[PDB]
Amino acid sequence: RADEISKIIRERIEGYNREVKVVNTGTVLQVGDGIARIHGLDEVMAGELVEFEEGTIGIALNLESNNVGVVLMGDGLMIQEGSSVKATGRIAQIPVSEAYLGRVINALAKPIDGRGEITASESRLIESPAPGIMSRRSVYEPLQTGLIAIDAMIPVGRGQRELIIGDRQTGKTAVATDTILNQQGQNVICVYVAIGQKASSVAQVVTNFQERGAMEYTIVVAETADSPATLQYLAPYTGAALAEYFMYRERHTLIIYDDLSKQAQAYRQMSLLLRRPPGREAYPGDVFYLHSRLLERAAKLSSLLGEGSMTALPIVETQAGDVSAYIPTNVISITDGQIFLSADLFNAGIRPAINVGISVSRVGSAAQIKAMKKVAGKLKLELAQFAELEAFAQFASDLDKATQNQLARGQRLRELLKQPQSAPLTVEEQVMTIYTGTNGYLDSLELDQVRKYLVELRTYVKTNKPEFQEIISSTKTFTEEAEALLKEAIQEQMERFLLQ
Amino acid sequence: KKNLGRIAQIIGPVLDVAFPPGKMPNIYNALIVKGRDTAGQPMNVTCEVQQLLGNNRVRAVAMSATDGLTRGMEVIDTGAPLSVPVGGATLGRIFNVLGEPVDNLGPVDTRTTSPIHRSAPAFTQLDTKLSIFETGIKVVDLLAPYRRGGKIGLFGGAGVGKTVLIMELINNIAKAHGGVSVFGGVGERTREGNDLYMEMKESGVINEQNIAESKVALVYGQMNEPPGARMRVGLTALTMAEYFRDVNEQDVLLFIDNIFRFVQAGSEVSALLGRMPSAVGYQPTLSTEMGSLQERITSTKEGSITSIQAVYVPADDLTDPAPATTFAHLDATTVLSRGLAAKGIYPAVDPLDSTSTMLQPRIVGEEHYEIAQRVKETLQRYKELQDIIAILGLDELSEEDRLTVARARKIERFLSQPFFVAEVFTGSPGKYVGLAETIRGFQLILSGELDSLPEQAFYLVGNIDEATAKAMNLEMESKL
């Protein structure tokens, strides 16, 4: 090796031989604190990323007449107002392979973890024609998040791009982490792109993924806040181009964006710098086009293409809890329904803070399994009745038995819903948990003990009645033998819980 | 360097200067202006280039006073992005944004200068040991624990707290942390900064006798400065901390107050700079600039820079972009609320909204987590019963919910602290209480076991035993 190190150099220096192509090249008029209004790049395709003389890669978005106004994908300190900047035949692609599994990357698809260097001889163009209607299919198979709230009331099927909206600090990153952590027994490649979150929170999330072991299959496309506006703009597109490759090669994926508020805010920055006319809330003209172009490539394909599915799950941080602002109403018009985390429900102990109300899903019971199609009906109906009767709870003074028992079962139902941090509940266990909550086999216990009793019941059942696992995991229906097995198991567990 | 300037236009603080075509400084490259003062020739006002306009002229915001500059003055560029003297020299001295001493003692040495605007630390080396801190405040040590080696946000309205709270926190921790302290007066009123300087030189932190013995190094770019200085005082404090985290390898605790000024000055210069206006009126590059400050503060495997920014939520606009992008960067946010200072409960930290990434049970303790959960749920119940209390009479709600309302009242009074630095406003002496004593106090308070004391016996009280004694004193002076 002692001189084989330079004998390796001989390979390249004798291989490459300089065909004399034409590089589109122009001077730099103006470097505008994140934008570089270079001049003269004539036949440069809109989006064809430019390369300066100091190696500062940047995309050429704004193609004006006398000055192609490019934006910089790195720091722009060293541009020197006249340095000949050369176009590059790349049209903003990223390399992509299954070797990207586990390593956290920037939007350049360059690993920022450190623990290797990904090789990838398959390149996917970042912005791409999304799956058309000939390709897309209806949502068949569900995607368990591990949450009784967002897996019984309102499903998330593979292909349906549900939306995690809510007040800041409510659990959006927590519900996303719960989904990616549950998605271990399954096969999904849970690409988690983080846009404008601080570096330290992404370190916490990546080490949480590592501690729970889910980091084997989840490309965490990290983008720190001090990354320039272009890279925070490009991160969702980068993760979309990775999950798109994995979806096209038959593998069900799940891309979880982080803070589309922050992503469209970075686009707002780069476009207001690039002198594009602003609309509502000073967001530029194509915010809705932007969010759709990256969020409408989240589809479940057909057998003609491979049956794989990208199943988005964006996160939109809305302040003061409003649906009215520009970006949340845009993303709510795009996404197939949404969910609603709320700060007051969160500080009222209910975790996850799923709003039992407005959080509708456009798919409905077409996603869930037959066991859920059975039991979630009663759960949804009883939560509807309890939420209507919620005002009567503090004033129920010896009212009739129907109202009293229904309201008491609702008061137990919300405690059934609230589940601990980062606790993944696979489909079988939450099925029996919902059944226990809805058909009354926990009415004798008070409000507090529902949680402890249900955790102990899930432990006892999943460890001592493995036939329930066979039935639910295998036959995927809540048939009478499973119903009787669960009834007897719950009864014996209530006896041993009276024995305490 | 040597590139003579010939300043073309001076439009407010933003001045743009037309260098020769070949020799042109880079972005964020300092420009010392060889100019005359109002009286007397020698006067060097520093300008940092913001962008190049392409007519051979660059736009440069002026760090010092803008008046007196003429069109056509010779200026030269340093070639280095505004080097600031730091290290073993910067201790004890109130520092200007330019890199100068302000406290009229001897000038510092420049043997350990450093560029102010540098690259952010890479994710490859990032030290994250999740650990709690015992600051001293009852509520913020219980309800929203603070992550040492991490960032902390003292959000609030205009005058709710966040500076008396910062003074109390520094009075606590300046002796506790063996690492140095750095105070960045980003756009805070000059008299409060001088109060802080007097308090530091009295409390031994400065130790004016041997100025190399201070545990602190101040940086003041306070209110009476052109918007250049408030655009870079935060980065001056950051450069001092980054030196204390690169070289001395010690956990430096930096304080920035009114970090919102680091966005307001950016707005006031961006509007002039030709950059179009963003939402409600700040700069377009709000997110990138705010991140360029608040990302350099990370524990980076040689030390841990714990920082406490006191964001200024303008007019209690919790949705305003200048705090809305800081809520993303800040670990242990503490949203102080004017509505809770209305009834006198100081500090007026919201028990609900003041939340932390350190209220996870494996990080804080299961008992701590369960008591914080019960306190926050009780306060949420009180906020949801506020409307029923407000209109339909206090008694017409439920009787168990009346127990919850009395418990919530006792809690939201008990989480008031008599500070040492706020002894002048309360009249009562300051009381310091650790996390354990207030934990045991909240247990017995919310547990309904001592739900018989009077309410004012819990308000402005250091501890639970102090509350029990105050109930005795109050019931005695009631009849007597």
């Binding site: 003061a320 409003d322 | 007019a315 949705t319 305003d320």
Partner: peptide, 12 residues
């Protein structure tokens, strides 16, 4: 937003 937010509070 301290103007719209107050009215949202009163509506709720």
């Amino acid at each position: 937003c301290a103007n719209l937010r107050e009215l949202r509070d009163r509506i709720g």
